[PDB]
């Protein structure tokens, strides 16, 4: 039928894996870090480590780990233009890994237009449909932002809201249908809310550290997370 059974679904869910953040405490919040068949969001301040984490994950997501997770090829659609292979080859070190590999290991794609963006989304599917199980993370940073551009003033939001969810929906059907992990950043019942299943909010704790809280995500803990950042990606904050 147009839909399956409960057992049959619980059959699928046995594939829900988590890509780590390198910040154990942080991972604890997401009960293991980034999740699959789910879009994770990055709420941040003008200067936030999200664009930093993205790189991290560009690699945590290549290192087999927790709950028998393999690791794999990733897709980094960049709108902002903050992608830094250099930052990558730098992280692959904290995890002692071949550089050319880590890079050979990610798939880069710069977004320019609110149309170009989905031009890519609808493509990503294709590369996911060809061969699956190779690609474990579809990281788009940032999604909105480029949409806050090709709008037609505070008067044509009617096209923005409509157009946005036109793919932000198509983005869900990728996540749970092809089974992957979609990390997304931005700065906003807001359409891009029920859309993203897990919403992480970020605040700075004085340069070194940062505090990641949950705005809204199934089984959301009231407690906060204390993670640190370095050249080697995101990591736990020590004494």
């Amino acid at each position: 039928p147009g839909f399956l059974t409960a057992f049959e679904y619980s059959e699928k869910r046995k594939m829900v894996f988590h890509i780590t953040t390198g910040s154990q405490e942080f991972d604890k919040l997401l009960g293991g870090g980034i999740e699959s068949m789910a879009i994770t969001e990055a709420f941040g301040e003008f200067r936030t480590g999200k664009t930093q984490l993205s790189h991290t994950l560009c690699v945590t997501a290549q290192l087999p780990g927790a709950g028998g997770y393999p690791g794999g090829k990733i897709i980094f659609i960049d709108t902002e233009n903050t992608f830094r292979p250099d930052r990558l080859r730098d992280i692959a070190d904290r995890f002692n890994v071949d550089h050319d590999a880590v890079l050979d290991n990610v798939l880069y794609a710069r977004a320019y237009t609110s149309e170009h963006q989905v031009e890519l989304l609808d493509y990503v599917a294709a590369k996911f449909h060809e061969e699956a199980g190779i690609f474990k993370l579809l990281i788009i940073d940032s999604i909105m932002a480029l949409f806050r551009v090709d709008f037609s003033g505070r008067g044509e939001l009617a096209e923005r809201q409509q157009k946005l969810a036109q793919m932000l929906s198509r983005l869900q059907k990728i996540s749970e249908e092809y089974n992957v992990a979609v990390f997304v950043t931005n700065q906003m019942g807001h359409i891009l809310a029920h859309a993203s299943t897990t919403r992480i909010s970020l605040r700075k704790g004085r340069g070194e550290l940062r505090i990641a809280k949950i705005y809204d995500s199934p089984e959301m803990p009231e407690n906060e997370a204390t993670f640190a950042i370095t050249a080697g990606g995101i990591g736990d904050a020590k004494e």
Copy 2:
């Protein structure tokens, strides 16, 4: 005639069966819990047990109950993406039931667009029409939440409010015609008011317990109900 006689109608109502909430003092508010041939609603806070209640009944309605109610299949349409089979196999225990069974006792289907959500409903009918007396519940959680989305800013409500009831009615016709019990959750003269024949508002009384009140329903008691939430779904709150 395009309508029946009061007697003939009473004929149909002898089939009106209640599906336990799991919390006796809750079932009393509904005089037996969730009722058939009627859209019931879930009025809850940011963090409400409805999401849990929804699974619970994915079970309760399999356990023969009062009124000589056999127990049957179920159709769960998830908009919010919070259906956790893993939670079901967890409750069947408190009811000493086969795990694989219960999970075969449920039909899952994720809703993505305010159009997909109906694309489904217009199909839920068919499966129901194809064969009857098998499916005893059609639970849609949550129903509105997806419509708040696809809308065209607060300027095209005229399309959403019209589209909304365009299906909400379709829901009713199913409910009473095919005779089931449709449970629906949300957080909102409102079109989705006359829509759902019974409406339950839920408030949390300090973590462990919950207070489910009746917003507006036939023969509505002033008194409130006190139920608790546990892995084994919902149940009464003892000393």
Copy 3:
């Protein structure tokens, strides 16, 4: 001609009968209760006995009485969905009458859409045109309410007001032309005013009793009415 004479009309009016309410004092207000060739309205509070009275009348209207009134077959178009044959078979007792009969005696019809509603109205005529004098009461509860739904925001009332009176008028032509009694409930120079020839307003007098006053109806008495309600329909309040 397109219209008759005065005598000739006074000829017709000799058929204006009243269906009782079981509440003598109440009946006194309506100078005999519900009238014919006239639409009666029910102004009420959130919790009003109108939906209660409706059932009562489902039977008072089958019991020959006052001013040589026979009694007969009724039509209960329900929008809200509060129809309870059970409440009927319960009232038929206060009047010592065959149950299966009372039920066999009413014609049920659930309204779903503002269109469905009139789909029914324009039908009712047909069943009235076929054979008359059998049907003495066309009870619609509630009329508006379902219309306050398929509207297009506070901006398209232009279709509501227009559509409403498009049939609320057609509802008059049924009442006086086919000679019957149309009881209607709702909660609002309002179009549905001159439309309904008799308007009764209802207030509660502490659980047991209720006070029915007149908002506007030919020969309207300033005094109030004190009626009580029980399983056996509406009745006079005793000491």
Copy 4:
């Protein structure tokens, strides 16, 4: 020429006849009561005797009166649905007249839509044209009340205000052309102002008596009139 001479016109006016109000001090305000070839209006409160006055004249205008006025047939168009023949046979007595007669002396016709109301008027002319000197009065109560209805909210008045006078003129042309006396009741530079040549405002002076004043009419007296209301219609108020 498309208009006559002053002399020739004076020719027609020798026919201008007054139809008693029943209350001499009222007739004086109208110098003989209701006047021919002129639309007169009824300005009353929530509970006003106009409704009664309307019947009264259904009689008065059958009783030969001053100015050698014979007395004639009548056309009563009821929008408000308050025409009670039973009330007529009641007054003919105070005038010692055959009951069946009076009631054969009146032509009844209920108005339902703001369109039906004219559908009629455009026919009232015909019956008048067919044969003349027979019908001495065309009473329409009330006229506006039905137009307030079919309108499209306060946003389409432009259609009602235009439609309104589209007939109100038709009324005038009848009045003066066919020579009758058209009486009309209501509760409102107003289009229905220049429309009705005479306007009477009525106020109740403690139940029994009533004060009918002149809002605006040719040769209008400051003094007021004091008439009483009784089963025998309207009449003077004695000591």
Copy 5:
């Protein structure tokens, strides 16, 4: 050419005559009373003698007088419906003149619609074009008033202003081209200002008398006029 010379025009102006008002002092204001090739206006209070004067002039304008003025046939287009041949035959007495003549002497025309009105205006020309020098006064009372009717709310004045001046202009071309006297009444740089060449304003001076001032008219005197009114038209107020 499309226009003449000055001498040639001064040739025409030797025909500018004045129809009296019977109120010498008043006539002094208008330097002889009503003028020709000029539209005179009547500014008044709710109860003003304008509709009274009109009748007067219906006759002053038949009595040869001042500046070798003959007298003649008149046209009284009435919108309001206050025309009273009876009042005429009454004035013809103050001037000792055959009654049937005075009447035989005026041409009556009732205006009903803002269209009907000009239907008449454009006709009047025709009767003026056929034979001239017979008709010395075209009296329209009141002009506006009927226009304040067929408007489409305070929103379609765009048709009123435009339509009004569409003929109020055509009214000028009658006045100066056919050489006559156009007296007009109403109650309002207002379009109907530059339009009417002479504007008289009226105020009451305690029942009997009235004070006529000039709002704006070539060579307008600051002083006021004191005229009286009786059955015999307007006349000078004595000691």
Copy 6:
């Protein structure tokens, strides 16, 4: 080329002639009075002598004057309907001139619609083109006043303001091309500002005398002018 040389232009300007105002101290403000090839305007109060000035010049411009100005025909376009030849024959005296002459020295033409007003102007050109050097003045009083009229409420100015200059330019082209002196009166960056090259504002200094000031014109003196008004038109104010 579609424009001439400065020398060639100076050629034309040697013809620029002034037409006396009649009041020497007024002529000085205009350095000789009304000037050729330039639209001059009349800024006056409710009661201003412009209307008089207009006639005056209908003469002055026939009386050979300074600058060896011969004197010529004239075209008077009256919107306001205040042209009184009788006034002209009155002034020619103060200038000892043939009456019949002066009045043959003027061309009259009444303007009715804002369209007629131009219908004319577009003809004034022709008569001018047909033969030249004959007409030395084109006086239009008043020009705006007629446009305030035909407009569509303050909501269609966009048509009037556009239509306005659509002719006002046509006026200019005449002025300078055909070389005349166009005088225009009114009571209003304003389109009719750059329009008229010279603008004169007039104020009355206690009946007898008048103060004409310059609102805005080439080489404008601060000092004011004091002229008097008399039957003999305008002239200086002696001791």
Copy 7:
């Protein structure tokens, strides 16, 4: 290519010359006075010498001077109509030059319509394209002003702003492409800002003198300029 090199451009710029103002100090501000391949603007007060300077420049621009500038034929498109050959033949004296020459030396063109204006602009090019190096100054006074006319109220600025810059741009392509000097006057990031490369503002310093400051122009000095005006154009203010 569609554009040249830097050297190649610096090749052209060796033709940038300045037409003097006769006011050395003023010329110092513009580093030599009016510049070429650049539109200069005149910001002024109600009574400003701009229309005075224009004439001056009509001649300074014919007198070989500074930085080996020849002198030449000019184009004076006048909208306002303040052109005075007389003022010219007067200035040619301060510079001891043949009169008929100075005049024979300028090309006059009066602007009437916002369309006529550009009709001319697009023409000027043509006369510049035929033969160049003869015409050194295209003086338009004033540009805007006539545009503030053919607008369609404060609502159609959408055509004004658009239309204005449609040629004000075409005006740049004349200036730098054909190498000339365009002086423009008016009284207003305003479109006509970046448009005009040099903006001079003018204030009066008590009749005789005037102070010219810079609103915005490359290398704009904070200091002010003190120039005087006489019949002989603009000149330096002495002791």
Copy 8:
């Protein structure tokens, strides 16, 4: 695939070269000055050295520099019309460079309309595509300023804001694809924000020196930079 690999991408970035600002403490803010494959912006006051900086770099980017940067051709698109080659030959000195060379090292092109400005950009690409590695910079000053112009009042921004990014993207694609360094100046979530990857805000610290800060850019230092402006372009500010 329509996008490359992270490794392959790192391949391209090894080419990212910085082009000196001339002020070492300025270059540090940009870690080497203006950066390749990125739109940098100039945030300045009314009087800012950007205009100068723009020329400077017309040189700097010809002088072999750090990162073994050779030095190349340049494309200068001037909207503001302030490009002064004369200024270039002036700086090459401080860098001991051939004058004719430098000026052959630059490609000039003036932008007139918001359409011309792109007409160009869409060509800048071609020349770039035709042959590569030759042009090392595409400087457009200023970019927005021309768009503020052609717009349709604040009511058609919807066209400008859309048109704006319609090219601003085109700019980006060039930048990173053809690998250059595009510098752009202006005075304004803003579409031209995500547009330019780096943004520099400039403030003047008392004539001689200037403070260039970073509004928002990757790895942005809090500290500010202090550079001076001189004929020799921009450079450091010594004791």
